[PDB]
User: Fold Protein ENL from Homo sapiens.
Amino acid sequence: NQCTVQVRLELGHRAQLRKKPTTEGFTHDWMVFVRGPEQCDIQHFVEKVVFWLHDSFPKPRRVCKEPPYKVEESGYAGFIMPIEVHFKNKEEPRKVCFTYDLFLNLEGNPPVNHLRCEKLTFNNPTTEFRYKLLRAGGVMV
Ligand SMILES: CC(C)(C)c1ccc(C(=O)Nc2ccc(CCC(=O)O)cc2)cc1
Assistant:
């Protein structure tokens, strides 16, 4: 049964100036996401993604149960965004948290377009979960 499976997640964000600062004077539009690499379907092993926005947002616990795993909002400032990626796994681990640095372009700088690549290593996953990771394009090591 000895077996290690690796899968890849990409977290990222885009930010630029709003032309029309909003009804609460929002200077930026931004978008944060979680995705797989090209030709991988992370929906096979990802139950859901939860984006924990700033406490100042309405309903700041944003849940994507299916792709795209993304939040699009307007704001005035960057903040640290907890992101939880829940797995379709019956044993441990059930999820992984990331602390995402959602930063905006200030002082009329070009738009932000950032990607953070994360490798997840699953040691001795169950038969069922191993199947999901490999279906998603996971690789045995
Ligand atoms: C500077 C600090 C405290 C980290 C921070 C950082 C960021 C923010 C921010 O942009 N909040 C916000 C911005 C837009 C909205 C949208 C409200 C709607 O849909 O009507 C709600 C809240 C607030 C505070």
In short: Residues 26, 54, 56-58, 74-77, 79 surround GKN (CB under 6 Å).
